[PDB]
Amino acid sequence: TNSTKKFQPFQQFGRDVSDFTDSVRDPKTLEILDIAPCSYGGVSVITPG
């Protein structure tokens, strides 16, 4: 997704508290991007035996 952080040109990647890649620059263009996992939410099942 699009992101609103602009940093100095000696930086390429971005790490959060858990050392996971969250913000990146792009090649083939110059634009900052945010990466997020697509596994989310809690799923519970109900069975009558």
Added chain:
Amino acid sequence: KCGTLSNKSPSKLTQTPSSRRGFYYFDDIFR
């Protein structure tokens, strides 16, 4: 070729305390 000074005063070694100066970016990772 280079100039040579004749006389000069001896260097004085007075000292001053710094105050929270001289820090640098130690990494190239955005935080």
